[PDB]
Structure formats: structure tokens, C-alpha cells
């Protein structure tokens, strides 16, 4: 039956390869909420350590006046799926990079199971206020013979059926179909995850994750109070920007160095949007430099309901980029190397030369008077073309950090930086 009601012994599944136990975060922090499996919560902490760390590298590789938008959950889910077929040093690297080894022995050895559990809690909860769904998938070459266990564990644990496409002969048309499926799952918001020419004739498998969020604000903004105003980019140019207005009671706190932290709850209170604004003339860099899940937890736990005036733009951002460079810097070497990569659990027919050529991410965010919409997707390509993509996106001034979190479980669904609010 269900992995949602099941327990480890119910579904005997343990993957092919297993990682060693290192030479237990000393002094467990953040006591778990009620009716919540210890193990799930630990996984939630693992992903949050990846979220902050990944952002750190990401924000370091862009101009400070750039927009950054991602869904670290999606990235984690997709790599965990990828992890199924990993072994030896490729698996250890994934384990460390994603923070999967920074938790207890049992949880560490049962990543996928707990991810299914954690996902059951995220998307399959009986008291929906806001919509939060997810869809996973495997797209593999039509002529190959994949490992049956691999399929089964991936369908059972992540809901990822395996769709056969003709990479070998119709490469270009396969990609489009993958993007069409991704567009479908994200309500036409993420239409182009995989970039032209990335998939080719030597392409074996494409692992995709999709996350979609749409929530109504708990305290709406009146459109008759929304107004226009010029926004001055760093360069010199300006653009129009519809700035919304509202007055009410909201969790807020003025922190160290004058940094303001504001919380905007979606109906239900299960999911909220946190905003982090540096002091008027203060750079975001320091805050971004000292961004650990501990510090974040401190800010949120200091917040005190207060009556205030909220001013925020009606906007839409979108980020699209490749994760190869960043992950490598962060420790993920083997997985992308055609000589050292070791993924022996994907294809039945002993073709053990696989390597992830490139992996793409793409997010979308829209904020308005009614609520907030967000979508995202990760696509990992096994054996295609490593291409060096888009090295230029608009630089604008005075950015704020945005976070779309799930409260009970403390999961960072979406996270980023809005520099250019003009649409």
C-alpha cells in the first residue's frame, strides 16, 4: 500500500550501494513539533543546511544587484532521486554535499523513505488552505534496458514513473516533450527548464522534479491602495513599479544592524513568506554571508506580532541557471566526470560509464494583492552535452531576500533575492 502510511519494514527496499558512517550534530537543536516523526524533521534540517549553503555559493557567483530565485527543495528531491543509482565516491559526495551525512545513522541509511514521508506531509495533507503540489519523473532512452528495481523504487518512493523517449534518433523533440511535461506540472509557469542542445544522441536518462505553490494572502492588499513609482536601477535607468500598500498586525522584528524581518502568512498559517530587508543604506552581503539555518531560526523566534505598514511591489521574477559549477565548488566532483562518475544502478544491461553531463534549475515567482504564486523544477541529464550557459542577466539596485517556508516542519520551499521589482 501507501508509503504515506507505511514503515521501513513494511516496504523492504534498501538501495544498491551504501555509504560509510563518518568519523550526529553535537547538541540537537530545534525540538520537533507535535505528531512529527523525529527522522522526518532531521531530513528537513538536512535540506535547510543545503538551502542556505547552496545559496551562499549562488549569491557569491552573481552580482549583488542581481535577482536570485530557486526552490532548494526541488534541487534536493532531484539529487536524492539521482542518488538511488550512485555508489562509491559519487554517492559519498552527494551524501555530504546535500547534508545527508549530518544526521543520524538510520535516517542517513534511509534517505529516500524519509523523503517520501516528508513529501507525504508537504503535498498530501488533509487540510489544504493553499495549494502545494509536486511531481517527479524519469525520462529514459527508448532502446535501453533500465534496472527494474531502480524503476520500482523510484516510482514507489518518489512517484517517478519512467517515460521512454527517443534520445538516440529524435533528441531535440525529446527535450521539448520533457519541457512540455514540466510546463504541465507547474501550471505553465516553468516552460523551458532544459535548454536547447543540452540533450543529444548519447543521452541516457533525464531525472526531473517539479514543485508548484499558489496561496492566498491571509491579510490581503487592496488594489485601490496599490500605486505606481519609478525604481532607480544601479546603472542609472529607471522603470515603473506598482507598489502595494496595507496596514495590519504582523510578526516583525528590527534586528542587528537595523535589519528588518517581516512575516507574511498565507491563509491557513501553515505556509508563510518571510522578508529580510537590510538597513536603508546597508549591503545585503553581510546578512547573506552569515546565513545559517540557526540564525534564520533565531530571527523567526524573535518576531513579535506588531501593528505596522507594509509596502511591497506587485511583481514577477524568474531565475534559470545550471547547477554544475556551484555543486562542484560545493564538493560534487565525481558525478559530472565521465571517468570518475560511478552510477551502476540505472541501466540493467551493464553500461557503467554513466555521468551527469549537466543539471538545470528554473524558478518563477509572482506576488500580488491576492496572494503569491511560485513554481520550480530541476532536470538532471545523464550523458549529454555540458554547455556553458547564460552569463548575463540584468543588474538593478536595492534587493531584499524572500523565503517561502512551511511552518510546522520548518522546510524552505522557495528562497531568493528580489533586486528588480519592476515588471
Ligand X SMILES: CO[C@H]1O[C@H](COS(=O)(=O)O)[C@@H](O[C@@H]2O[C@@H](C(=O)O)[C@@H](O[C@H]3O[C@H](COS(=O)(=O)O)[C@@H](O[C@@H]4O[C@H](C(=O)O)[C@@H](O[C@H]5O[C@H](COS(=O)(=O)O)[C@@H](OC)[C@H](OC)[C@H]5OS(=O)(=O)O)[C@H](OC)[C@H]4OC)[C@H](OS(=O)(=O)O)[C@H]3OS(=O)(=O)O)[C@H](OC)[C@H]2OS(=O)(=O)O)[C@H](OS(=O)(=O)O)[C@H]1OS(=O)(=O)O
Ligand Y SMILES: *[C@@H]1O[C@H](CO)[C@@H](O[C@@H]2O[C@H](CO)[C@@H](O[C@@H]3O[C@H](CO)[C@@H](O)[C@H](O)[C@@H]3O)[C@H](O)[C@H]2NC(C)=O)[C@H](O)[C@H]1NC(C)=O
Ligand Z SMILES: *[C@@H]1O[C@H](CO)[C@@H](O)[C@H](O)[C@H]1NC(C)=O
User: x/- contact string, 87-116, with ligand X (CB under 6 A)?
Assistant: -----------------xxx----------
Nearer to ligand Y among residue 141 and residue 406 (C-beta): 141
User: x/- contact string, 207-246, with ligand X (CB under 6 A)?
Assistant: ----------------------------------------
333 class by beta-carbon count within 10 Å (0-12 exposed, 13-18 middle, 19+ buried)? middle
Reduced to 3 states (helix: H, G, I; strand: E, B; else coil), residue 113 is: helix
Which residues, 6+ apart, have CB-to-CB distance to 136 below 8 Å? 77, 78, 81, 154, 158, 159, 160, 208, 209, 210
Rounded Cα distance between 371 and 389, Å, is: 33
Among 325, 386, 387, 322, which residue's Cα sits nearest to residue 357?
A: 386
Alpha-carbon distance values, 298 to 30, 49, 71, 274, 291 (Å): 10, 15, 22, 13, 11
Segment contacting ligand X (CB under 6 A): 5-13, 229-237, 249-257, 264-272? 5-13
299 annotated as a binding-site residue: no
**Number of residues binding to ligand Y, judged by CB under 6 A:** 10
41 annotated as a binding-site residue: yes
Rounded Cα distance between 324 and 309, Å, is: 42
Give the footprint of ligand Y on residues 150-179 (CB under 6 A).
150, 153
Give the footprint of ligand Z on residues 13-52 (CB under 6 A).
17
Alpha-carbon distance values, 55 to 253, 382, 410 (Å): 23, 24, 17
Identified binder of ligand Z from the candidate list 87, 244, 317, 376, rule CB under 6 A: 87
* Cell numbers that stand for 147 in this block: 534496472
Nearer to ligand Z among residue 87 and residue 380 (C-beta): 87
Nearer to ligand Y among residue 17 and residue 333 (C-beta): 17
Reduced to 3 states (helix: H, G, I; strand: E, B; else coil), residue 194 is: coil
**Number of residues binding to ligand Z, judged by CB under 6 A:** 3
Nearer to ligand Z among residue 17 and residue 407 (C-beta): 17
User: x/- contact string, 30-49, with ligand X (CB under 6 A)?
Assistant: -----xxxxxx---------
Residue 338: DSSP 8-state? T
Out of ligand Y, ligand Z, ligand X, none, what residue 88 binds, judged by CB under 5 to 8 A for its kind, is ligand Z
Look at the chain and count its residues.
Answer: 423
Give the footprint of ligand Y on residues 290-349 (CB under 6 A).
345, 348
| Residue 88 lies near ligand Z (rule: CB under 6 A) | yes
* Cell numbers that stand for 317 in this block: 521574477
Binding residues vs ligand X (CB under 6 A): 7-9, 35-40, 104-106, 117, 121
Would you list which residues are annotated within the binding site for heparin?
A: 41, 121, 137
Binding residues vs ligand Y (CB under 6 A): 14-16, 147, 149-150, 153, 184, 345, 348
Amino acid at each position: 500500500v501507501d508509503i504515506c502510511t507505511a514503515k521501513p519494514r513494511d516496504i523492504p527496499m534498501n538501495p544498491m550501494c551504501i555509504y560509510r558512517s563518518p568519523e550526529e550534530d553535537e547538541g540537537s537543536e530545534q525540538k520537533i513539533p507535535e505528531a512529527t516523526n523525529r527522522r522526518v524533521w532531521e531530513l528537513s534540517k538536512a535540506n535547510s543546511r543545503f538551502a542556505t549553503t547552496f545559496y551562499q555559493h549562488l549569491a557569491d557567483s552573481k552580482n549583488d544587484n542581481d535577482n536570485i530565485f530557486l526552490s532548494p527543495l526541488s534541487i534536493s528531491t532531484a539529487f536524492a532521486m539521482t542518488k538511488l543509482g550512485a555508489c562509491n565516491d559519487t554517492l559519498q559526495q552527494l551524501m555530504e554535499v546535500f547534508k545527508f551525512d549530518t544526521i543520524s545513522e538510520k535516517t542517513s541509511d534511509q534517505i529516500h523513505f524519509f523523503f517520501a514521508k516528508l513529501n507525504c506531509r508537504l503535498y498530501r495533507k488533509a487540510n489544504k488552505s493553499s495549494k502545494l503540489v509536486s511531481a517527479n519523473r524519469l525520462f529514459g532512452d527508448k532502446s535501453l534496458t533500465f534496472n527494474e528495481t531502480y524503476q520500482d523504487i523510484s516510482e514507489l518512493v518518489y512517484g517517478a514513473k519512467l517515460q521512454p523517449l527517443d534520445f538516440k534518433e529524435n533528441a531535440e523533440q525529446s527535450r521539448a516533450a520533457i519541457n512540455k511535461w514540466v510546463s504541465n506540472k507547474t501550471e505553465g509557469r516553468i516552460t523551458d527548464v532544459i535548454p536547447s542542445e543540452a540533450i543529444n544522441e548519447l543521452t541516457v536518462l533525464v531525472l526531473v522534479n517539479t514543485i508548484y505553490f499558489k496561496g492566498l494572502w491571509k491579510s490581503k492588499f487592496s488594489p485601490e491602495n496599490t500605486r505606481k513609482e519609478l525604481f532607480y536601477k544601479a546603472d542609472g535607468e529607471s522603470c515603473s513599479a506598482s507598489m502595494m500598500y496595507q496596514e495590519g498586525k504582523f510578526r516583525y522584528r528590527r534586528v542587528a544592524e537595523g535589519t528588518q524581518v517581516l512575516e507574511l502568512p498565507f491563509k491557513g498559517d501553515d505556509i508563510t513568506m518571510v522578508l529580510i530587508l537590510p538597513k536603508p543604506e546597508k549591503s545585503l552581503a553581510k546578512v547573506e554571508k552569515e546565513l545559517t539555518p540557526e540564525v534564520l531560526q533565531e530571527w523567526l523566534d524573535e518576531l513579535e506580532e506588531m501593528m505596522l505598514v507594509v509596502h511591497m511591489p506587485r511583481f514577477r521574477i524568474e531565475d534559470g541557471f545550471s547547477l554544475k559549477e556551484q555543486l562542484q565548488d560545493m564538493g560534487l566532483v565525481d558525478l559530472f566526470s565521465p571517468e570518475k562518475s560511478k552510477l551502476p544502478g540505472i541501466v540493467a544491461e551493464g553500461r557503467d560509464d554513466l555521468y551527469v553531463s549537466d543539471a538545470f534549475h528554473k524558478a518563477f515567482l509572482e506576488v500580488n494583492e491576492e496572494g503569491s504564486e511560485a513554481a520550480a523544477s530541476t532536470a538532471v541529464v545523464i550523458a549529454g552535452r555540458s554547455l556553458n550557459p547564460n552569463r548575463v542577466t540584468f543588474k538593478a539596485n536595492r534587493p531584499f531576500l524572500v523565503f517561502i517556508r512551511e511552518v510546522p516542519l520548518n522546510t524552505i520551499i522557495f528562497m531568493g533575492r528580489v533586486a528588480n521589482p519592476c515588471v
